[PDB]
Structure formats: C-alpha cells, structure tokens
Design a protein around this nucleic acid. Structure first.
Ligand SMILES: [Zn+2]
Length: 252
DNA sequence: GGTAGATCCAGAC
DNA sequence: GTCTGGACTAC
C-alpha cells in the first residue's frame, strides 16, 4: 500500500481496536520483528496493554498503547484485518495480536517485507524507523523551500530525491512518476538541474497528486500505451534503480 | 558525510 | 533462470 492507502487503514482500523486489551501476541515470521530484536521480548511487553490510539507517519502506522508504541510498515503487500480468534487464519498471516474480547488484529504479507518496532512511547520518534523521517507531504513543513534546499545539495536524480524518506515522508514510486509527469519533468533529470520554477511546480503537483489520492493514471504502468495528453507512447526504463514511467514528449 | 550497491522474499516471466 | 521492490554497509 502507498501513503493514501495507509491513511485509510489508520482511519478504518482504529475504531476496530481502540480500548481493546492485548492478551497475547503470536509471531510466525520473526524476521518481521525489528525491535526488540528478540521476538519473545516484543510479544511479552505488549501483553496487558490497551490500544489507545493509531497515528500515521509517512507510510508507517504508529499504534499507541499504554506505555509503548508499535511502529509498523507494510511495504509492498502487507495488510491488517480484525477477526475472531475462532476462525482459521488466512494464508500468509505472520503476526497476530490477540485481544481479551476474543478478537484479533492480524498482519498478512505474502512477500514478508513488512517491519515492526516497539518502543516506549516517548522514545519512538527518536529511534528507527521514525528517526530522520522527513515532513508529511501534506504539511506546511514540506515546502518548496525545503525541497529546493535538498535538490541543490545532491548529485542524484529528481526521482531518487523524491523517493528519499528523509526528504519527504512516504512518497512512493507511483506518485513520484505521476507527479513528475504532471510537473513536466523527466525523472532522470539531476535534482540540482531543476529551476526554482520547476521545484515550485513539482511541489505543487506532489501535494495535489497525493492529496487527491488521500481524499486516472497518466504514466505509471502505462508503458507502450499512448500518453493521455499527447499520444506519444509512454516509455519505461530504470531510474534510481526502479521501474520508471514517463512521456518523452510531455516531460523534459 | 553523501551515495551506490546490497538486501529481503516469493510471484511473474 | 531472471527480475522486482522500501527503507544497512562500505566506497
Ligand atoms: Zn505526453
């Protein structure tokens, strides 16, 4: 899931778990547990705590308990569901939080790329994976000025810059490619090569593109198909090590 | 200290 | 078999 989908999860999941008390934590792929490194300590500390809130930072979910926070990233394919402890688990279920009311919060992930970190609440924001996270793309803290400052410093492509979590929180490939198309900028352009006008426009399209989604594609996944604005075949190449889509006529 | 390269996984070719 | 992707290690 990308940022908009994660925000939907935050909103919809919260009322399904708030006020429930954890009675057990079961782990079927320990590699997902990143802190404490020992999955047994992860499970033990959570027991007895009640879910009090659920926040989002970038693509991270932050579950707020009594003393601790659970920081969760779904990567490409992770998903949460709430269901009865009486029913069989769905395939690829790797972590389960069991509540005292006989319901469960289940984490599934076919690829097993997702991560979980638990810390005392007061520490979570100053430890990985939240430490160094850049500003929310929809916040005044992410400004053209901030983007400009980062762009001028680096030798990397503009795509690489936007994918950088320290620059802006949780802005993924689909939105990078779409935002760059909408801003008329080739993804392979050196970030430092962007003019003030291009930075301003890119910021505007980033906020618009992801803002629209949080509340229909031009290039992403459209290789070999006509651009919706000029009819030129959309191309796909590798940029910043990732599959990257663009129109060679609309973007410069 | 900034950056490329490496990494994890299993489904799609 | 090869390719793919979000967010330490070593040049
Ligand atoms: Zn075009």
């Amino acid at each position: 899931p990308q940022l908009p989908e994660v925000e939907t999860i935050r909103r919809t999941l919260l009322p399904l778990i708030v006020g429930k008390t954890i009675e057990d934590v079961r782990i079927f792929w320990p590699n997902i547990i990143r802190h404490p490194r020992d999955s047994e300590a992860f499970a033990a500390r959570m027991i007895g705590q009640t879910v009090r809130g659920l926040e989002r930072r970038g693509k991270f979910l932050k579950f707020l308990l009594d003393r601790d926070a659970l920081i969760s990233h779904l990567r490409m394919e992770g998903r949460y569901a709430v269901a009865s402890a009486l029913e069989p688990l769905e395939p690829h279920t790797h972590v389960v939080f069991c509540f005292t009311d006989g319901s469960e919060l289940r984490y599934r992930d076919v690829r097993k790329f997702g991560t979980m970190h638990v810390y005392a609440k007061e520490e979570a924001d100053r430890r990985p994976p939240l430490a160094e996270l850049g500003p929310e793309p929809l916040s005044p803290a992410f400004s053209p000025a901030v983007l400009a400052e980062r762009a001028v410093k680096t030798k990397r492509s503009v795509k690489a810059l936007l994918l950088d979590c320290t620059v802006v929180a949780g802005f993924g490939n689909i939105y990078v490619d779409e935002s760059l198309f909408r801003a008329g900028i080739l993804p392979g352009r050196p970030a430092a090569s962007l003019s003030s006008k291009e930075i301003e426009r890119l910021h505007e399209e980033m906020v618009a593109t992801i803002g629209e989604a949080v509340m229909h594609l031009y290039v992403y996944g459209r290789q070999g198909n006509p651009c919706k604005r000029c009819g030129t075949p959309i191309e796909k190449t590798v940029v910043a090590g990732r599959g990257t889509h663009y129109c060679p006529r609309c973007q410069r």
